[PDB]
Coordinates of N, CA and C in Angstrom, one line a residue:
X1 N -12.4 -21.1 -13.6 CA -11.1 -20.6 -13.8 C -10.5 -20.2 -12.3
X2 N -9.2 -19.8 -12.3 CA -8.6 -19.1 -11.2 C -7.8 -17.9 -11.6
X3 N -7.9 -16.8 -10.9 CA -7.2 -15.6 -11.2 C -6.7 -14.9 -10.0
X4 N -5.5 -14.5 -10.0 CA -4.8 -13.9 -8.8 C -4.0 -12.7 -9.3
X5 N -4.2 -11.6 -8.5 CA -3.5 -10.3 -8.9 C -3.0 -9.7 -7.6
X6 N -1.7 -9.3 -7.6 CA -1.1 -8.6 -6.4 C -0.3 -7.4 -6.9
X7 N -0.5 -6.3 -6.2 CA 0.3 -5.1 -6.5 C 0.8 -4.4 -5.2
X8 N 2.0 -4.0 -5.3 CA 2.6 -3.4 -4.1 C 3.4 -2.1 -4.6
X9 N 3.3 -1.1 -3.8 CA 4.0 0.2 -4.1 C 4.5 0.8 -2.8
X10 N 5.7 1.3 -2.9 CA 6.4 1.9 -1.8 C 7.2 3.2 -2.2
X11 N 7.0 4.2 -1.4 CA 7.7 5.5 -1.8 C 8.3 6.1 -0.5
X12 N 9.5 6.6 -0.6 CA 10.1 7.2 0.6 C 9.8 8.7 0.7

């Protein structure tokens, strides 16, 4: 299989 996960969070 192939699996990819990306998460991004930004707070002022």
